[PDB]
Design a protein around this ligand. Structure first.
Ligand SMILES: *[C@@H]1O[C@H](CO)[C@@H](O[C@@H]2O[C@H](CO)[C@@H](O[C@@H]3O[C@H](CO)[C@@H](O)[C@H](O)[C@@H]3O)[C@H](O)[C@H]2NC(C)=O)[C@H](O)[C@H]1NC(C)=O
Ligand SMILES: *[C@@H]1O[C@H](CO)[C@@H](O[C@@H]2O[C@H](CO)[C@@H](O)[C@H](O)[C@H]2NC(C)=O)[C@H](O)[C@H]1NC(C)=O
Ligand SMILES: *[C@@H]1O[C@H](CO)[C@@H](O[C@@H]2O[C@H](CO)[C@@H](O)[C@H](O)[C@H]2NC(C)=O)[C@H](O)[C@H]1NC(C)=O
Ligand SMILES: *[C@@H]1O[C@H](CO)[C@@H](O[C@@H]2O[C@H](CO)[C@@H](O)[C@H](O)[C@H]2NC(C)=O)[C@H](O)[C@H]1NC(C)=O
Ligand SMILES: *[C@@H]1O[C@H](CO)[C@@H](O[C@@H]2O[C@H](CO)[C@@H](O)[C@H](O)[C@H]2NC(C)=O)[C@H](O)[C@H]1NC(C)=O
Ligand SMILES: *[C@@H]1O[C@H](CO)[C@@H](O[C@@H]2O[C@H](CO)[C@@H](O)[C@H](O)[C@H]2NC(C)=O)[C@H](O)[C@H]1NC(C)=O
Ligand SMILES: *[C@@H]1O[C@H](CO)[C@@H](O[C@@H]2O[C@H](CO)[C@@H](O)[C@H](O)[C@H]2NC(C)=O)[C@H](O)[C@H]1NC(C)=O
Ligand SMILES: *[C@@H]1O[C@H](CO)[C@@H](O[C@@H]2O[C@H](CO)[C@@H](O)[C@H](O)[C@H]2NC(C)=O)[C@H](O)[C@H]1NC(C)=O
Ligand SMILES: *[C@@H]1O[C@H](CO)[C@@H](O[C@@H]2O[C@H](CO)[C@@H](O)[C@H](O)[C@H]2NC(C)=O)[C@H](O)[C@H]1NC(C)=O
Ligand SMILES: *[C@@H]1O[C@H](CO)[C@@H](O[C@@H]2O[C@H](CO)[C@@H](O)[C@H](O)[C@H]2NC(C)=O)[C@H](O)[C@H]1NC(C)=O
Ligand SMILES: *[C@@H]1O[C@H](CO)[C@@H](O[C@@H]2O[C@H](CO)[C@@H](O)[C@H](O)[C@H]2NC(C)=O)[C@H](O)[C@H]1NC(C)=O
Ligand SMILES: *[C@@H]1O[C@H](CO)[C@@H](O[C@@H]2O[C@H](CO)[C@@H](O)[C@H](O)[C@H]2NC(C)=O)[C@H](O)[C@H]1NC(C)=O
Ligand SMILES: *[C@@H]1O[C@H](CO)[C@@H](O[C@@H]2O[C@H](CO)[C@@H](O)[C@H](O)[C@H]2NC(C)=O)[C@H](O)[C@H]1NC(C)=O
Ligand SMILES: *[C@@H]1O[C@H](CO)[C@@H](O)[C@H](O)[C@H]1NC(C)=O
Lengths: 196, 98, 439, 195
């Protein structure tokens, strides 16, 4: 419940939008109009390197700035371990949202876990390597391809003096499992009354 | 067991723990003693309608005086009546044989 | 149209045009996600418990939608990330008189996209700007409320693509630069450098016209190329429906999401479409009856949405596979398939990024200004029949010549031009003429 | 990819099985329970609820199967095209069979699929040269046929594009068209005459 700027007709007690969600209410005691908002603001995504590998995670909040996440997720009502992911030192801002719990490095690698908007995540060793064996979730900009220089000139050509024989492999599905369903068995399988 | 990757998760973290109840301040309780305990009641054909407004409907006041052989609610539940506020209520009264 | 079929008469073009046509192909759509619990029984614990009893449907629906999103990213990667080396944009964008300025990005412009790509990104209206909404933008006045906020309040969100428009523009710039400097060679194996005029002569050979036709008429061909690019830019700058297919994809997705939201107001045989109303009026048993009715209705509508999304994603995937095939066959090579790249004889092709799609500029050779001639299948010299190789016999007004089919260039009939086979009797329409002997 | 197809089918079938334990607003997910507890009328109410739910889940399964079969059919059509064009012929289409210049191809059976071994030619070890569009001999311009004029350190040669094989410039190797003035970048050189 929050204060609202919604303007109400003199006698209407609540307001609803097209989906019939109750957007606003009027307080009977004070006659002020309050906005009602959903408890969960929007989607959150957990990034994990595999429970096999680690128990570390990163959290991505899709619609929020990094300044607004503790309010957006109601950190004061969460457990302290969630509040650890509400705010911190490892906080990064992406066009996908705010990403918390991943170290941001300026090296660009091939995409491993796609965060979005050009940002990927991985499980590299920490750059500092103080423990020399620690590994952290690392967030970086995806590398599109290898940098190459080709020199355009007039009156100069490049001609191959050699060749290689290459054999590559291409895997193609052509079929799937043929399945049959005896719907009478699936629903009311042994019951005569149900079959009727 | 989870393979590596990014997964959208549903909200399990935050749940409500407090209830805020906001009713209009109405002092007087509804005149059940006047409606139910009246010297005379009309006939069925000349049935009378009365409007009830600006009151608190507390049926417990009837418990030590009135029996109510029949009490049947249709649009709503009877266990919900204490938690509801009505925009308007009418009372039709008459007498019939059993 | 009237075409006059005759024996012993041929039509041969004396001129040509450079034609640049444009082809718009969708390659992806909006990646959407649904928080099922938010959509049905969004804030109600009691309803959520009932939903748990109902089934594992929400897991399956979310799985389907996430598969679709990963497919969208795969589509874009397959179409655009077809080159391993990111060739740098050349400093000088004029090769042999051919102007690549409008195709390539401009260093002075703040935008990293090229000019034509700027026009394209202007053409499509929405480009998913409305779908994204920051925190706190949905609280406001009654006029401030819009459909996107209704989507947000009910668990329907749009995920951003993995590749940024700047990265896609970088891919297309690398492709165009590699074509300008390396030619067709970078498509397979290492990138060999070639002057643009020599690469154009190679393309002309691939069409069937000889190299000298390109080299002698180089200035005219360059001017026609530049004028065609200017016309492309002018047609794009004025309002048009060239990009109607991309807009159609956008509109379909937006309308589907809006219908999904509107279905929540729809009653399904329950006393009310609002869950809180029946929860606050009815005791838990009959409340569970009504709530189960509402749950069934909303689950059914969500399933409808997801099924239509799977079918649409299949269409988009077929389109993206075709676009990848065109990038391989039209951009990294010269295609001998008829009408696959351009209408004429395909010469070369350029990719441009467009919102959720690719635009192909196909450069083709179009013969024109045909002239009628009299022809012979063969020429009887002494006792032997002579057949042209890579040519056709045409009677000019004065004498017989041999010419290539696509371009009229008369040549003397020598023993090198034509080969000998058989005798004069078998051929039908053979005519008497001298065959020059260089020795 | 083949493993993905296998996994999708197995997972869909498992989901179909697990949906039977799912209640659909009936008192119980077990049909025998409501049959043994309730008299036929209210039993028919509950059983209709269960029937509708299970029929819906089965219909979901079959619709997903139709869509997956459409994907597999597109893949199999492409595979048949590749068998026609890569295995029974030599493809001039760029990147349709292999990355390099396609040379040949072999099929191998795989579980519910086919694996194509594409043999291709990949040029390598390129060398830079200086080139000319044409060669002005006496008054006439000479254009190569099936080659490029290339400047070796000593003298001009003509070679094929994909493999460096220098050849002497003879009248058989090159043809004559037009004059030296029109061409841009024409260079003076002798053209050998075999006679
Ligand atoms: C190849 O394309 C480039 C486009 O980047 C051409 O450069 C541009 O040429 C136009 C035409 O001159 C210039 O814009 C206009 O010039 C006229 C004068 O004719 C003037 O009245 C207008 O107000 C405007 O200035 C423009 O400055 C110039 N540069 C750029 C970056 O657009 C180029 O001429 C084309 N041809 C080549 C390179 O051979
Ligand atoms: C219902 O209660 C509210 C209090 O919540 C009353 O509002 C108060 O009114 C007095 C007199 O005007 C003010 O001094 C208080 O500041 C008000 N309090 C608030 C919170 O607004 C309201 O008047 C009551 N209504 C009735 C009919 O008794
Ligand atoms: C209904 O109303 C009548 C009238 O008020 C009630 O009769 C009174 O009962 C009280 C005892 O509580 C006596 O002291 C009064 O003298 C009675 N008055 C009259 C006029 O008879 C009657 O008790 C009420 N019944 C109920 C169930 O409330
Ligand atoms: C989140 O941060 C962005 C900046 O990255 C804010 O966007 C700016 O908003 C101000 C105020 O409206 C504008 O003047 C700027 O032009 C915006 N910048 C950009 C790049 O869009 C945004 O308002 C922030 N959101 C919240 C809820 O604080
Ligand atoms: C082929 O057609 C083109 C297009 O009309 C001709 O190019 C024109 O040539 C005239 C002079 O003959 C110039 O004044 C024009 O400016 C040219 N136009 C363009 C667009 O370049 C060309 O001459 C014709 N060639 C032959 C052999 O017929
Ligand atoms: C070449 O000449 C022939 C005439 O000898 C042209 O054929 C005529 O074309 C006109 C065009 O409308 C028709 O109306 C006549 O019926 C045709 N008659 C015959 C006998 O062919 C032919 O069109 C000419 N071709 C070109 C390219 O000009
Ligand atoms: C095709 O026939 C024409 C006559 O219709 C030939 O005419 C040439 O005309 C010019 C100027 O009139 C003369 O200078 C040439 O000497 C003529 N050629 C001769 C006499 O062989 C033309 O040469 C013929 N060949 C073509 C056009 O390739
Ligand atoms: C091309 O077609 C013309 C028109 O039919 C042929 O000319 C005819 O030839 C027959 C057989 O010699 C004569 O009987 C007719 O009198 C001819 N008609 C005319 C109008 O000349 C001609 O023979 C055909 N040419 C070839 C090579 O088949
Ligand atoms: C091409 O020339 C030959 C030889 O001059 C022609 O063959 C002669 O045709 C006439 C008439 O049919 C005969 O009387 C001669 O006996 C033929 N000579 C031989 C050696 O066959 C032939 O007709 C000419 N072709 C055309 C189309 O006129
Ligand atoms: C052929 O020689 C030219 C130089 O004449 C090479 O071009 C240089 O290539 C290097 C390679 O990193 C670049 O750093 C230079 O900037 C280029 N300079 C010029 C002027 O081109 C070319 O790479 C050589 N090609 C091969 C295949 O060795
Ligand atoms: C290309 O130029 C080279 C010189 O850079 C020519 O050199 C040949 O070198 C060998 C051994 O040094 C001699 O035996 C040959 O006689 C030389 N060729 C001559 C002198 O013509 C080479 O021949 C040239 N042509 C190629 C490599 O095809
Ligand atoms: C290939 O490009 C070079 C470099 O621009 C050209 O060399 C220039 O030619 C102009 C015109 O004569 C001169 O004014 C410059 O001084 C030259 N620069 C250098 C560094 O030599 C060359 O002409 C071009 N070759 C062809 C065939 O177009
Ligand atoms: C190829 O050789 C010809 C003939 O020797 C050169 O043409 C001469 O060029 C000079 C300088 O421009 C003139 O003074 C002569 O009058 C020209 N002669 C003729 C017949 O045109 C030509 O320049 C040479 N080409 C190159 C690239 O050096
Ligand atoms: C995953 O668990 C297995 C034990 O079953 C272990 O052998 C393996 O090393 C683990 N993977 C890691 C730690 O990356």
């Amino acid at each position: 419940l929050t204060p609202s700027s919604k303007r109400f007709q003199p006698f209407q007690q609540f307001g609803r939008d097209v989906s019939d969600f109750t957007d606003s209410v009027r307080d009977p005691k004070t006659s002020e109009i309050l906005d009602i908002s959903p408890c969960s603001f929007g989607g959150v995504s957990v990034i994990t390197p595999g429970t096999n590998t680690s128990s570390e995670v990163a959290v991505l909040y899709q619609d929020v700035n990094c300044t607004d996440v503790p309010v957006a997720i109601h950190a004061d009502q969460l457990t302290p371990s969630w509040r650890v992911y509400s705010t911190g030192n490892n906080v990064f801002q992406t066009q996908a949202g705010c990403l918390i719990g991943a170290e941001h490095v300026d090296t660009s690698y091939e995409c491993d876990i796609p965060i979005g908007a050009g940002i990927c995540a991985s499980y590299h060793t920490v750059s500092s390597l103080r423990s020399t064996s620690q590994k952290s979730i690392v967030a970086y900009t995806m590398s599109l391809g290898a940098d190459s220089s080709i020199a355009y000139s007039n009156n100069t050509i490049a001609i191959p003096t050699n060749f290689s024989i290459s054999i590559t492999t291409e895997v193609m599905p052509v079929s799937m499992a043929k399945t049959s369903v005896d719907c009478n068995m699936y629903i009311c399988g042994d019951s005569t009354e149900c079959a009727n | 067991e989870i393979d590596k990757g990014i997964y959208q998760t549903s909200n399990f973290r935050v749940a409500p723990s407090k209830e805020v109840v906001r009713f209009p301040n109405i002092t007087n309780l509804c005149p059940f003693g006047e409606v139910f305990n009246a010297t005379t009641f009309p006939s069925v054909y000349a049935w009378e309608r009365k409007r009830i407004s600006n009151c608190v409907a507390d049926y417990s006041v009837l418990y030590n005086s009135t029996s109510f052989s029949t009490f049947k609610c249709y649009g709503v539940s009877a266990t919900k009546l204490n938690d509801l506020c009505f925009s308007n209520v009418y009372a039709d009264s008459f007498v019939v044989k059993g | 149209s009237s075409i006059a079929y005759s024996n012993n008469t041929i039509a041969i073009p004396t001129n040509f045009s450079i034609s640049i046509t444009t082809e718009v192909m969708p390659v992806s759509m909006a990646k959407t996600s649904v928080d099922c619990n938010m959509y049905i029984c969004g804030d109600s614990t009691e309803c959520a418990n009932l939903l748990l009893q109902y089934g594992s449907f929400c897991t399956q629906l979310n799985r389907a939608l996430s598969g679709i999103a990963v497919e969208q990213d795969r589509n874009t990667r397959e179409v655009f990330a077809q080159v391993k080396q990111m060739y740098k944009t050349p400093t000088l964008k004029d090769f042999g008189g051919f102007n690549f300025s409008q195709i390539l990005p401009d260093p002075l412009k703040p935008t990293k996209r090229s000019f034509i790509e700027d026009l394209l990104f202007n053409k499509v209206t929405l480009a998913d700007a409305g779908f994204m909404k920051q925190y706190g933008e949905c609280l406001g006045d009654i006029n401030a409320r819009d459909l996107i906020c209704a989507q947000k309040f009910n668990g329907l969100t749009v995920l951003p693509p993995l590749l940024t428009d700047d990265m896609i523009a970088a891919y297309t710039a690398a492709l165009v630069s590699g074509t300008a400097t390396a030619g067709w060679t970078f498509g397979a194996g290492a990138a060999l450098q070639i002057p643009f005029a020599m690469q154009m002569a190679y393309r002309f050979n691939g069409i069937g016209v000889t190299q000298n036709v390109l080299y002698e008429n180089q200035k005219q061909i360059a001017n026609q190329f530049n004028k065609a690019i200017s016309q492309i830019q002018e047609s794009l700058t004025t309002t048009s429906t060239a990009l109607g297919k991309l807009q159609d994809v956008v509109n379909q997705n937006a309308q589907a999401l809006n219908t999904l939201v509107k279905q929540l107001s729809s009653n399904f045989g329950a006393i009310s479409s609002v869950l809180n109303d029946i929860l606050s009026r009815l005791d838990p048993p009959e409340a569970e009856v009504q709530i189960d009715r509402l749950i069934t209705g909303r689950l059914q509508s969500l399933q409808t949405y997801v099924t239509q999304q799977l079918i649409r994603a299949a269409e988009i995937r077929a389109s993206a596979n075709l676009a990848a095939t065109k990038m391989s066959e039209c951009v990294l090579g010269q295609s001998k398939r008829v009408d696959f790249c351009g209408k004429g004889y395909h010469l070369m092709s350029f990719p441009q990024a467009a919102p959720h799609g690719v635009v192909f500029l196909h450069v083709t050779y179009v013969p024109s200004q045909e002239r009628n001639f009299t022809t012979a299948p063969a020429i009887c010299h002494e006792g032997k029949a002579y057949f042209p190789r890579e040519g056709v016999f045409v009677f000019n007004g004065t004498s017989w010549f041999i010419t290539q089919r696509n371009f009229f260039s008369p040549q003397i009939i020598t023993t090198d031009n034509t080969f000998v086979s058989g005798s004069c009797d078998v051929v039908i329409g053979i005519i008497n003429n001298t065959v020059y002997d260089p020795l």
